[PDB]
Amino acid sequence: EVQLVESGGGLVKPGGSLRLSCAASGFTFSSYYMNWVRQAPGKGLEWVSSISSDGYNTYYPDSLKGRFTISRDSAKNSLYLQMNSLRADDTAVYYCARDFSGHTAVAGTGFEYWGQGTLVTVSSASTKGPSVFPLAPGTAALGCLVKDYFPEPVTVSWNSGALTSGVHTFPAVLQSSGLYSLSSVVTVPSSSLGTQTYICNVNHKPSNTKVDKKVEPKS
Amino acid sequence: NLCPFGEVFNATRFASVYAWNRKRISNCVADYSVLYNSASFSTFKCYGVSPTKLNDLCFTNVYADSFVIRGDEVRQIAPGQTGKIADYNYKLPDDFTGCVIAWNSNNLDSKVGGNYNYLYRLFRKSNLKPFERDISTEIYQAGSTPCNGVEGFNCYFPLQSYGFQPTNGVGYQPYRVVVLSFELLHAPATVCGP
Amino acid sequence: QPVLTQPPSVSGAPGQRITISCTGSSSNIGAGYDVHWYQQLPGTAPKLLIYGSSSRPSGVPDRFSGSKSGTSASLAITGLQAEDEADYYCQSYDSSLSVLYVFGTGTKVTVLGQPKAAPSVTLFPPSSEELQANKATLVCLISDFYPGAVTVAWKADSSPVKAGVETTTPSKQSNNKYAASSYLSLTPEQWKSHRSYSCQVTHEGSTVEKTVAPT
Ligand SMILES: *[C@@H]1O[C@H](CO)[C@@H](O)[C@H](O)[C@H]1NC(C)=O
């Protein structure tokens, strides 16, 4: 019942500023401490910031040197993290978390609930939209390739999410040009290729791009 | 003739914020250097006077107000502040002259399973005037219908318990607060400094 | 100050009991603060697993247990299952306003007893749309192999292709197996000028290869 959804992540130039938002639902918002934590890609977890239930107390670690600010809004039941003087070392997936209940023994010590997390990439490069190409085909392989995009991440669904069985999405690779590329495939029976259309949907939030590609068997 | 600041700060038991304890200091010399040089205080903020010049001045009436609050509520003990504690338990005036001292007391005022002795006032009809102390326990009418002395629909007990635990976060841990108020009214200046 | 230390990885076969240690100091664990354990599945956000150093929320089976003593804590998993392969993080609290929430190093737990699986290799030729854009990429997908250690080579009809090869490190699949991908980049000229292109995958001394043609 407790929903926490993050947004605002993407590309930010080094030294720039970025605002991350986290919408919360399913609980009394003004009754819990709220927190921001971060995880670098393939690295551990680091607590970033904390705010009290009323919103007048802010807590940060000295490592951040006070360039992060946390605020909360009960009129929208949202939590905001503002980041200034950003650098490449701040590139990470950021989660908004809800603390424990005030009527417990571990109040204000942990992170009971977590959000989906949003990727913040600090780079001197430029955000670029992706190009989606069809990988055309007893069973057969049916794929589509997302190429030349920056920064991470992208999400691939099939037939607006209706198809889930046999869908394998592969991790991206970093090309020498500095652009990412991944592919998504699915194993489908040969007969239904003659009766069912297959659409793959690619979402690239940092560039605000959505693409629907039709993959059809050639020859 | 040393001022008895020891029995206030070094006291074993502290009162609730809604029933904050008050002691008056008179006919003595106060060595404030023992206070501001001791780094055992989380917050030590003075308004209208500095800790140093306090040792060179005299005042007619000085009051030490002792109570216990939450950590994230220590911010409310300041002039021109709004919040539950400030509005309903302890209010400081805009022209406040004096010092506010607060130190963590988790090892003393917290216990496993919860310490529920400390209470604070949750509701009131109007905001609390400065230095006004309210210890009434009448049922707060929160709307249209009267309560007749029972709880329920828009009828709540004005006082709620804190529930301090040792494992809680620093914002939930108990804090002991002493507010020193020096007034210097049209009266003999009974307290002074060396 | 500054983090809690855990073993980098703990492994065990399905059925036995494994333990993950969490070494704190007198500032966080020895200060009287509880320890929490979070489990992170690959590609997902961390989820609370243990709170209060011994208490589990709803949905956590009794196989997970926690303990703390002195300046250390421990998480015990009894009857290991293939679904427990994940990252486990311990966490504590510091009274100092400059530290507060202290996170553990993190431990990767892997479960043994899986049979070695030959990789499933599928090769794709450049799409007609890509050639219309003066580009061409070869896509080689590897999936369902164990252990996660493969080597990928590309052949120019018999000949090396080391330029334009991008290969991803093997990543854990949801079925506890592993997947990987390799890409070859070239202009349409080399694609057409060669009869065939081969993606070769070597795994445990056994090689599986696929070939595509511009026909
Ligand atoms: C509390 O006792 C100690 C004992 O040395 C003393 O130094 C201190 O002054 C006393 N409290 C205060 C703040 O006066």
Author numbering:
A (entry chain H): 1 to 52, 52A, 53 to 82, 82A, 82B, 82C, 83 to 100, 100A, ...
B (entry chain A): 334 to 527
C (entry chain L): 1 to 9, 11 to 27, 27A, 27B, 27C, 28 to 95, 95A, 95B, ...
Reported in the publication:
Here, we delineate the molecular interaction between a therapeutic antibody (ADG20) and SARS-CoV-2 receptor-binding domain (RBD) by X-ray crystallography and characterize its binding epitope. Here, we identify a site of vulnerability on the RBD of the SARS-CoV-2 S protein that is targeted by a few diverse antibodies. Importantly, such antibodies, as exemplified by ADG20, compete with receptor binding, exhibit high neutralizing potency and show broad activity to VOCs, including Omicron, to a conserved region that is present also on other SARS-related coronaviruses (CoVs) including SARS-CoV-1, WIV1, and SHC014. Thus, antibodies like ADG20 take advantage of the properties of two sites: targeting the RBS region that confers direct competition with receptor binding and strong potency and, on the other hand, targeting the conserved CR3022 site that imparts breadth against not only SARS-CoV-2 VOCs but also other SARS-related CoVs.
ADG20 is an affinity-matured progeny of ADI-55688, a broad RBD-targeting monoclonal antibody isolated from a SARS-CoV-1-convalescent donor. Like ADG20, ADI-55688 cross-reacts with RBDs of SARS-CoV-2 and SARS-CoV-1 and neutralizes both viruses. ADI-55688 differs from ADG20 by only five amino acids, with three located in the heavy chain and two in the light chain. These mutated residues in ADG20 confer a nearly 200-fold improved binding affinity and a 100-fold increased neutralizing activity against SARS-CoV-2 compared to ADI-55688 (10). We also determined a crystal structure of ADI-55688 Fab in complex with SARS-CoV-2 RBD at 2.85 Å and compared it with the ADG20/RBD structure. These two antibodies target the same epitope through a near-identical binding approach. The VH S52a substitution by glutamic acid in ADG20 leads to a salt bridge with RBD-R403, and the VH W100b mutation from valine increases the interaction with VL H34 and VH F96. These substitutions appear to stabilize the conformation of the light and heavy chain CDRs and result in an improved off-rate. DH1047 and ADI-55688, which was evolved in vitro to produce ADG20, were both isolated from a SARS-CoV-1 convalescent donor.
